[PDB]
């Protein structure tokens, strides 16, 4: 309130160099411009997407930078022409937006907003190409339009979802990424029917969300596939009924799955980012009616490759961005499902650290087995 | 009737050598065994599938052989345990079957019958591995279980569709292949909505069937693509609204289409058999909601290849066998649509010759621009 229209002085975790530990710095946060809001961050988290651009290996090295794109916060002030958000609103900043004006935003199927779709190299604000962060007079790059590793951040209002103000902001700060992506990959894109079989490649947060969606859809068999056998017991909490490590088999995994299911699974969801797993996820679905959904992001420019007859045998291949959920229209409904005990969120939380110890979240992530770490603001 | 249970002596067009002209021979046709029927052929036609296996380039050279898989005929007699067909029934023998007992035959989506799905190398009958054709005591290979280039042929009853006995058998003899495949590729698999745009790659019989389906679906723009500009005027009779030759453009055809439609077509149907056209058909559909359907059969084992991000941008890739139509359950309904003036068939007929001049049908086919040639039995 007293900060409305004013520059805020607060702390942010700044990445000065690729792959080096973040530094808690005193920064200045400009007030929000047209169509922007300024958000007090209460909880944030870390995922491989932040780590990938912080490591900047084979990536355009934008530094200094404030990473972070999964957070729960409260609106502090709104910029010109913002009417759907007001101070005090509980919100999730999300790495992609919904302008409400383009053909995608008017569609049933697509969340590929022409204005506000994710952009990993945009270092400033959409309104004016400027940064809202400075340190000692010098600007700092934004990340995904969210930059949630700060006590306050400025975000285009199209990337800010208003949610149930009774929702606990530490549990929902992780609906902005992997959970909703896998949940919607199964429910919106794969669309299994009751009793069907589903194979999930990758049992990180995305695959676990896909498993929850497959249980909500009523799948009778949910086969979780992962090179990492440590992730199996964890996965069974999220709906996975059988676990398969490819390392334990001489046969290719798509043959292993087809043999388990008499021709292949009804649905598959690829949640690894490995192009080889995308091929395998496609080839492991049944002929005639099988549907595979690609979710993982490939690191290189290897191409998906398969014999065309695999399609002529009546397989279908789909792909998803953020579970095909619209961030402003649909994500609040995801939170509502959590509030109505229809969706599991607490079991994603494997770690927690205060903001001053944010670098430990990188350690837990890079060591493996960390699903999400709740980074608590204030100390 | 008088021929029931007897060997029939009749004429067939026999291929003795790869790529050499057929010879009209006096053959013997055995009576039908269990689950088989013997059919008097009144009209048959020729398509590239017959030519491909008659040329036998890179193909297993089964000779001598009776080709032919598009025909209209009348049941002469039925074998043991046949109850859905009786003598006098008007029928279409079809290159693939419907046993009615497997999971595909109980499905909504799939026509991939486990027992009777198409098999290009099967030279004998399913019942006993034997040929029902002999010439001077020596057997002749069957083709696709149909072998319609004979005055009489024996076919598994699962591959024989009973149709409206008032349907003209010369017009419907071409519903057994390209027409129904493209029609169902659009209506059953691509599923455009009213007002949407559809790009069709290849304007042979398959692409023309896809165009008819796109008009029935109410597509506002139907863009026909083909290297052969002679096929354009023809295509407009079948629903194509715009024609594009790739040769006339420096830009890749998928870019040409995207530029015509502001991001890409809503639906595409690939009806060429060229793997490069399958890639192009996929990449030319709009992001967010585009759906491409593969129909053409590739000659080699080149693989379909695309950047995985094309799917993550929410494109869908499907494939079809015979338009996903079940041959015994659905094909009679296709004929009914012709009988109710809802489907154009006469305009597929570009040529006609008597059976003794069947080799001319090969000439008209190999020269190009022939859609279908009605081969009339009896002289
Ligand atoms: N499509 C979208 O909109 C989104 C895509 N993603 C992508 O989804 C993927 C999954 O993300 P997270 O779950 O956070 O990642 P993660 O790294 O936590 O989980 C990946 C899991 O897959 C396993 N794995 C890797 N290669 C494998 C292979 N060849 N076969 C079997 N298992 C394999 C790993 O052991 C690990 O358990 C990533 O590529 C991420 O970039 C993430 C969020 C949004
Ligand atoms: N999926 C299925 O169940 C079925 C598949 N097919 C396949 O469908 C395809 C089409 O069959 P028809 O219409 O009878 O063949 P067709 O040879 O009469 O027509 C193909 C057309 O595509 C054109 N074309 C070829 N390469 C092209 C390219 N790269 N770009 C643009 N145009 C190109 C040709 O000029 C020709 O007009 C064939 O591959 C056939 O084997 C046929 C029937 C059943
Ligand atoms: Zn938009
Ligand atoms: Zn994330
Ligand atoms: Zn069957
Ligand atoms: Zn044919």
PDB file of N, CA, C and O and ligand atoms in Angstrom, chain B residues 97-106 111-117 326, ligand 5:
ATOM      1  N   UNK B  97     -10.405 -57.682 -44.083  1.00  0.00           N
ATOM      2  CA  UNK B  97     -11.569 -58.375 -43.577  1.00  0.00           C
ATOM      3  C   UNK B  97     -11.988 -57.932 -42.184  1.00  0.00           C
ATOM      4  O   UNK B  97     -11.355 -57.082 -41.550  1.00  0.00           O
ATOM      5  N   UNK B  98     -13.091 -58.529 -41.736  1.00  0.00           N
ATOM      6  CA  UNK B  98     -13.702 -58.239 -40.437  1.00  0.00           C
ATOM      7  C   UNK B  98     -14.201 -59.566 -39.871  1.00  0.00           C
ATOM      8  O   UNK B  98     -15.296 -60.016 -40.217  1.00  0.00           O
ATOM      9  N   UNK B  99     -13.403 -60.189 -38.989  1.00  0.00           N
ATOM     10  CA  UNK B  99     -13.792 -61.483 -38.431  1.00  0.00           C
ATOM     11  C   UNK B  99     -14.898 -61.353 -37.396  1.00  0.00           C
ATOM     12  O   UNK B  99     -15.623 -62.327 -37.159  1.00  0.00           O
ATOM     13  N   UNK B 100     -15.042 -60.182 -36.773  1.00  0.00           N
ATOM     14  CA  UNK B 100     -16.094 -59.930 -35.813  1.00  0.00           C
ATOM     15  C   UNK B 100     -15.846 -60.498 -34.437  1.00  0.00           C
ATOM     16  O   UNK B 100     -16.714 -60.361 -33.565  1.00  0.00           O
ATOM     17  N   UNK B 101     -14.680 -61.098 -34.208  1.00  0.00           N
ATOM     18  CA  UNK B 101     -14.383 -61.784 -32.962  1.00  0.00           C
ATOM     19  C   UNK B 101     -13.231 -61.177 -32.175  1.00  0.00           C
ATOM     20  O   UNK B 101     -13.175 -61.372 -30.960  1.00  0.00           O
ATOM     21  N   UNK B 102     -12.320 -60.456 -32.817  1.00  0.00           N
ATOM     22  CA  UNK B 102     -11.154 -59.918 -32.135  1.00  0.00           C
ATOM     23  C   UNK B 102     -11.432 -58.531 -31.555  1.00  0.00           C
ATOM     24  O   UNK B 102     -12.493 -57.938 -31.756  1.00  0.00           O
ATOM     25  N   UNK B 103     -10.448 -58.024 -30.806  1.00  0.00           N
ATOM     26  CA  UNK B 103     -10.630 -56.765 -30.087  1.00  0.00           C
ATOM     27  C   UNK B 103     -10.803 -55.591 -31.043  1.00  0.00           C
ATOM     28  O   UNK B 103     -11.564 -54.660 -30.757  1.00  0.00           O
ATOM     29  N   UNK B 104     -10.086 -55.606 -32.173  1.00  0.00           N
ATOM     30  CA  UNK B 104     -10.272 -54.573 -33.188  1.00  0.00           C
ATOM     31  C   UNK B 104     -11.698 -54.585 -33.730  1.00  0.00           C
ATOM     32  O   UNK B 104     -12.347 -53.536 -33.838  1.00  0.00           O
ATOM     33  N   UNK B 105     -12.209 -55.773 -34.067  1.00  0.00           N
ATOM     34  CA  UNK B 105     -13.565 -55.864 -34.589  1.00  0.00           C
ATOM     35  C   UNK B 105     -14.611 -55.490 -33.547  1.00  0.00           C
ATOM     36  O   UNK B 105     -15.749 -55.184 -33.914  1.00  0.00           O
ATOM     37  N   UNK B 106     -14.259 -55.496 -32.264  1.00  0.00           N
ATOM     38  CA  UNK B 106     -15.167 -55.003 -31.233  1.00  0.00           C
ATOM     39  C   UNK B 106     -14.917 -53.543 -30.876  1.00  0.00           C
ATOM     40  O   UNK B 106     -15.583 -53.018 -29.980  1.00  0.00           O
ATOM     41  N   UNK B 111     -10.018 -50.742 -37.503  1.00  0.00           N
ATOM     42  CA  UNK B 111     -10.392 -51.808 -38.426  1.00  0.00           C
ATOM     43  C   UNK B 111      -9.252 -52.805 -38.627  1.00  0.00           C
ATOM     44  O   UNK B 111      -9.234 -53.537 -39.622  1.00  0.00           O
ATOM     45  N   UNK B 112      -8.300 -52.851 -37.691  1.00  0.00           N
ATOM     46  CA  UNK B 112      -7.089 -53.654 -37.838  1.00  0.00           C
ATOM     47  C   UNK B 112      -7.310 -55.105 -37.425  1.00  0.00           C
ATOM     48  O   UNK B 112      -6.582 -55.613 -36.567  1.00  0.00           O
ATOM     49  N   UNK B 113      -8.306 -55.772 -38.011  1.00  0.00           N
ATOM     50  CA  UNK B 113      -8.656 -57.144 -37.640  1.00  0.00           C
ATOM     51  C   UNK B 113      -7.425 -58.036 -37.519  1.00  0.00           C
ATOM     52  O   UNK B 113      -6.605 -58.101 -38.429  1.00  0.00           O
ATOM     53  N   UNK B 114      -7.321 -58.748 -36.390  1.00  0.00           N
ATOM     54  CA  UNK B 114      -6.164 -59.609 -36.151  1.00  0.00           C
ATOM     55  C   UNK B 114      -6.107 -60.772 -37.134  1.00  0.00           C
ATOM     56  O   UNK B 114      -5.014 -61.200 -37.515  1.00  0.00           O
ATOM     57  N   UNK B 115      -7.262 -61.303 -37.539  1.00  0.00           N
ATOM     58  CA  UNK B 115      -7.288 -62.468 -38.417  1.00  0.00           C
ATOM     59  C   UNK B 115      -7.156 -62.080 -39.878  1.00  0.00           C
ATOM     60  O   UNK B 115      -6.410 -62.716 -40.633  1.00  0.00           O
ATOM     61  N   UNK B 116      -7.887 -61.052 -40.293  1.00  0.00           N
ATOM     62  CA  UNK B 116      -8.123 -60.802 -41.709  1.00  0.00           C
ATOM     63  C   UNK B 116      -7.566 -59.475 -42.213  1.00  0.00           C
ATOM     64  O   UNK B 116      -7.899 -59.075 -43.335  1.00  0.00           O
ATOM     65  N   UNK B 117      -6.726 -58.785 -41.443  1.00  0.00           N
ATOM     66  CA  UNK B 117      -6.124 -57.559 -41.958  1.00  0.00           C
ATOM     67  C   UNK B 117      -5.295 -57.866 -43.206  1.00  0.00           C
ATOM     68  O   UNK B 117      -4.797 -58.981 -43.385  1.00  0.00           O
ATOM     69  N   UNK B 326     -14.605 -50.370 -41.209  1.00  0.00           N
ATOM     70  CA  UNK B 326     -14.701 -51.824 -41.149  1.00  0.00           C
ATOM     71  C   UNK B 326     -15.370 -52.355 -42.410  1.00  0.00           C
ATOM     72  O   UNK B 326     -16.436 -51.854 -42.800  1.00  0.00           O
TER      73      UNK B 326
HETATM   74 ZN1  LIG C   5     -11.270 -59.265 -36.315  1.00  0.00          ZN
END
